[model samples]
Target: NDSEKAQKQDIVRVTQTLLDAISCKDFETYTRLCDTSMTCFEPEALGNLIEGIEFHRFYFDGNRKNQVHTTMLNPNVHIIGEDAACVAYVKLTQFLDRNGEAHTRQSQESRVWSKKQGRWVCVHVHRST
Candidate 1:
């Protein structure tokens, strides 16, 4: 039981680190957090979606600073094994603007992560509005 609890905590910390890397626009760190065979599904095309969010900050409303200050409203992490886990939850947040405006947008997301060598990496991700 103790080991399981520790594993869950580890997964949560890893996930938070991944989110932090993205919010800070550290692509190198973000990329390192992902598995080589990672697959991400969003509302739009992958390349376009990444470009829009990573560069232009285009999201639900319009052009704005896409800094995701994620509050994990409900996080459910299922440990698949010693080296893998799945997390699902709903994230609620407001669209952050350069001029300090917050517009509300809520979404659900699921992600699968696996440990490679000794580091955690996200293998798959799916999100919906």
Candidate 2:
């Protein structure tokens, strides 16, 4: 039970870290939080679907100290096993560009975590909005 509690804490911390990364436009940290094997799905490609949206181009704002701000709302985490879990029903609010444009997006996201060596690492991610 203690281990489960710790795992849950770690998951929440990491999830918050991810939110912080996005708000600060820290893609380096954001990418580190992401699983390399992660695949994302969107309703429309917009332009280049395979290439996807570049984090730097979209998330980074040179004009502002904080380019993006994301609020994770109604996040629910489900522990699948000792080393795996999923987070669902998250609402993301993002502020984009210098004009202070904001948008709210909702998605169901699942993250598969593994204890690699001695640390928790995300092995897979699936998200849809």
Candidate 3:
């Protein structure tokens, strides 16, 4: 159906915008992509659980200043139902170390998005390193 295509289009746009936000270090755009009650499950080394939008902001504030290049591999966005979807992918990040050295890291992540007030917003994200 055209409706399904439209839904996928919108979701992909949101996901791509999020990628750009992280790469550009645009904290405002990053936060704008999330829901008010967003929660996050991060790696234990990176802090296990993050609850609320404000906490997500506080936690990622430091990372927002870093210069990072990210590549999403095998990204799969599945429509969980009419109003929600799950996006799963493996991400690779290249970062410049303090001495101008490049280091790489990897993570597997899944984000839950739901329609809120006519737009899709990320409600929860689970990440593992």
Candidate 4:
């Protein structure tokens, strides 16, 4: 139980760092934390499952931001055996609107991570608003 607790903490830690990378549009950190074969089903995919990081790399180039940050609300981390884990959470994204007002959007998001070379790397993701 104690060991599992520690692993969950690590999962949460990485998950938060992943969000931070997104907030800053730090593609380097984002790519470093994700696997080469990472796949996702996001709203941007237009109802198709997209494979590889190139699809995500586009988002990094598109957005030049304004005070954006995300909160992982009520994250549930499930450890699947020794090398894989899944996490689900309400992603509360806060940002300055076009009118310079604060706005928030909540999305349901889940991610799967696999251990490779003694480190956790995100392999799959799904999200819906």
Task: By TM-score, rank the candidates, best first.
Answer: 4, 3, 1, 2
1-129 per-residue lDDT for model 3 (tens digits): 678767766677788788778676677888788887888888752776677766545445554547677888867878766789888889899889889999999989888889887878898888886
Candidate 4 displacement at residue 73 in angstroms = 0.5
Worst 10 residues of 3 by lDDT: 56-65
Q: Which has the higher TM-score value, candidate number 2 or candidate number 4?
A: 4
> How does each model score on lDDT?
0.70, 0.60, 0.78, 0.90
Write candidate 2's Cα lDDT for 1-129 as tens digits.
888777777887787776677566676776676655554444443332223235333645555344445666666667877767766546566555566666655656565566656666655555565
**Could you tell which candidate, 1 or 2, scores higher by lDDT?**
1
Q: TM-score of every model?
A: 0.76, 0.64, 0.79, 0.95
lDDT of 1 by residue, 1-129 (tens): 789889988888888776666556666666678766676766655433232224222322343236656566667899877998998878776556678887777778788888889888888877786
Candidate order by decreasing lDDT: 4, 3, 1, 2
Better of 3 and 4 by TM-score: 4
Best of the two (1, 4) by TM-score:
4
Query: Using lDDT as the measure, which candidate wins?
Result: 4
lDDT, residue 45, candidate 3: 28
Q: Model 2 Cα displacement at 125 (Å)?
A: 3.0
